[PDB]
């Protein structure tokens, strides 16, 4: 099972941390996981808010519904859930505020369906799995 936290990074910070994306991964991992003193956590949260963009919810909804048409999917407001053809896998997409969360199982096609919509919306999505230490840009 894969679990990605995906943020839309501002251009200025993407550029600044080009070739140093591990530092952004560590910032995000500190917010989601690391046991930080309350004040360190609050600074980290403020920083994350600053360097990221709000998810364009209505734009995402439109693009998702077009791409998933006649796929095994359902929508529950900001949650999309899909099952791949021929029983090959499953994935959940959740969008809220500045964060997208994806959970996937089976073939890597499962998350790829969502990543393909995202990468056509912007080159600036950074997807990170804090369980497996897999992270990177969704490259168009």
């Amino acid at each position: 099972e894969r679990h990605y936290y995906t943020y839309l990074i501002k251009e200025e910070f993407a550029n600044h941390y080009f070739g140093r994306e591990s530092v952004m991964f560590e910032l995000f991992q500190d917010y989601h996981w690391t046991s930080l003193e309350k004040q360190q956590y609050e600074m980290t949260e403020k920083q994350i808010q600053y360097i990221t963009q709000p998810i364009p919810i209505l734009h995402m909804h439109q693009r998702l519904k077009m791409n998933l048409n006649k796929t095994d999917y359902r929508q529950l407001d900001y949650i999309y859930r899909i099952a791949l053809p021929k029983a090959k896998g499953h994935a959940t997409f959740m969008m809220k505020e500045h964060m997208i969360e994806i959970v996937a199982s089976g073939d890597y096609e499962a998350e790829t369906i969502f990543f393909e919509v995202l990468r056509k919306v912007s080159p600036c999505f950074l997807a990170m799995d804090f369980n497996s230490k897999r992270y990177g840009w969704l490259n168009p």
Binding site: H16, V23, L27, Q39, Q40, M43, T44, K46, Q47, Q49, Y50
Partner: protein, 82 residues
């Protein structure tokens, strides 16, 4: 003096607050603290490495300008973490 560097940094933050947007001031500047002034070097404590890096990269000129406007002197600005 110990109280004197606090005064200088508080004055510089108050001027910086009149220059920057609220999100930039609150995110990057507001939690900084004076650490030391020795020779030509003013050392400022940033709350974490991420902040240290961005302050060094983006705000050193602004801080140096602010200190120059307040004192008439050029101070080298350095950032450390706790």
């Amino acid at each position: 003096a110990m109280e004197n560097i606090l005064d200088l940094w508080n004055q510089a933050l108050a001027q910086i607050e009149k220059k920057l947007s609220k999100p930039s001031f609150e995110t990057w500047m507001k939690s900084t603290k004076a650490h030391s002034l020795q020779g030509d070097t003013l050392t400022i404590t940033a709350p974490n490495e991420f902040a240290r890096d961005w302050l060094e990269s983006r705000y050193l000129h602004l801080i140096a300008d602010t200190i120059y406007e307040l004192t008439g002197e050029e101070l080298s600005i350095k950032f450390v973490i706790p």
